[PDB]
Amino acid sequence: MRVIRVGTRKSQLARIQTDSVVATLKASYPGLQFEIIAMLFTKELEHALEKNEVDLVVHSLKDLPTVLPPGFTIGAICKRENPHDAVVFHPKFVGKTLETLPEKSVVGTSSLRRAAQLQRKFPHLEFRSIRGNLNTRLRKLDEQQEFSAIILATAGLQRMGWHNRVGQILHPEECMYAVGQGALGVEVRAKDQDILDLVGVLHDPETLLRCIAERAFLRHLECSVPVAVHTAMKDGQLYLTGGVWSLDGSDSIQETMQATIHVPAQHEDGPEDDPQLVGITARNIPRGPQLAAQNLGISLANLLLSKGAKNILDVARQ
Ligand SMILES: Cc1[nH]c(Cc2[nH]cc(CCC(=O)O)c2CC(=O)O)c(CCC(=O)O)c1CC(=O)O
């Protein structure tokens, strides 16, 4: 353990996210040296991991599939930023809400999950795909008049320093978030235990359990489907709400389940070589609550499946 090599894409958001993690690692490990190597695109980064070119990579958790290639694992789930979706309005609709927009106002989003939920809740608005990164989308919004508004993650605006552009934050009842949204995942080599121990300091127990539940739900249903969730840990209880929608949002199934899961306060010297749970390795967090969280997500998926979720999903791909 001497120089820690952190790989990163050249994009601005990826670069910011990577920096926030490196900052947190330096703070914990002031005596070590960290170096940033700037290069699904996920498979080029993984290749650099595979080749020992870098030791770790930072991702937005929702961009990581519930099943990772053998030889890689999520070594860290960092404290969640705000998970909710948000609305940025055209320069003409300040103070306005989705509720208050004019009929047939056009809302830009390329997300099936967002479009399906928002068409259902706002049948008088028009939802249309929009392309580009966050910067490009904001320019199109202000520089033309195709869009009366766009939908983006609260968390991404926040990290870009554009929170003041947020006109509306959506509640679960209007729009539930994507699995893992607002959380960062650090990906490493599954068998590299030094690195795993090192990044293990980043795990936020609460976010870790929430994301295990959410990703177990997602995986058991079997980025590119109209599925959404909401999680909360409150008073020793983990709450999981999940939903599935048809492309137009007309068909819908949503349910909530709950389980007693303590949020673990203390770390522990845990079993090396226990299997990762939904791609995640957290040997320093108690196993029990992790299993309980995964079981909760499995439970909810089965309930939705018994209610027809599979045929909704077969019709709602991308
Ligand atoms: C799986 C995934 N990854 C990203 C793209 C991406 N990946 C991470 C950030 C920010 C939030 C965080 O990092 O979770 C976002 C950008 C957006 O959600 O505002 C999107 C949104 C696509 C857009 O509407 O065209 C989705 C789909 C889901 O959200 O329904």
Swiss-Prot record:
Location, primary (coarse class): cytoplasm
InterPro entries reported for this sequence: HemC, Porphobilin_deaminase_cofac_BS, Porphobilin_deaminase_N, Porphobilinogen_deaminase_C, Porphobilinogen_deaminase_C_sf
Known outcome of mutating R189Q: In AIP and LENCEP; uncertain significance
Pathway membership, UniProt: Porphyrin-containing compound metabolism; protoporphyrin-IX biosynthesis; coproporphyrinogen-III from 5-aminolevulinate: step 2/4
Effect in UniProt of substituting A48D: In LENCEP; likely pathogenic; decreased hydroxymethylbilane synthase activity in homozygous patient erythrocytes
Keywords of the record: Acetylation, Cytoplasm, Disease variant, Heme biosynthesis, Phosphoprotein, Porphyrin biosynthesis, Transferase
Effect on the protein of changing V88D: In AIP; severely decreased hydroxymethylbilane synthase activity
pH dependence of activity: Optimum pH is 8.2.
Keyword Plastid in annotation: no
GO biological process: heme A biosynthetic process; heme B biosynthetic process; heme biosynthetic process; heme O biosynthetic process; protoporphyrinogen IX biosynthetic process
Gene Ontology terms, MF aspect: hydroxymethylbilane synthase activity
Modified residues (S-(dipyrrolylmethanemethyl)cysteine): C223
Keyword Cytoplasm: yes
Cofactor(s) of this protein: dipyrromethane
EC annotation from Swiss-Prot or TrEMBL: 2.5.1.61
Residue(s) carrying Phosphoserine: S111
Reported impact of R159C: In AIP; severely decreased, if any, hydroxymethylbilane synthase activity
Outcome (variant: G297S): In AIP; less than 3% of activity
Effect of D63G: In AIP; complete loss of hydroxymethylbilane synthase activity
Annotated SUPFAM superfamilies: Periplasmic binding protein-like II (SSF53850), Porphobilinogen deaminase (hydroxymethylbilane synthase), C-terminal domain (SSF54782)
Subcellular location: Cytoplasm, Cytosol
Bound cofactor: record note: Binds 1 dipyrromethane group covalently.
Subunit structure as annotated in this protein's UniProt entry: Monomer.
Family of this protein: Belongs to the HMBS family.
Protein name: Porphobilinogen deaminase
Organism whose genome encodes this protein: Homo sapiens
Encoding gene per record: HMBS
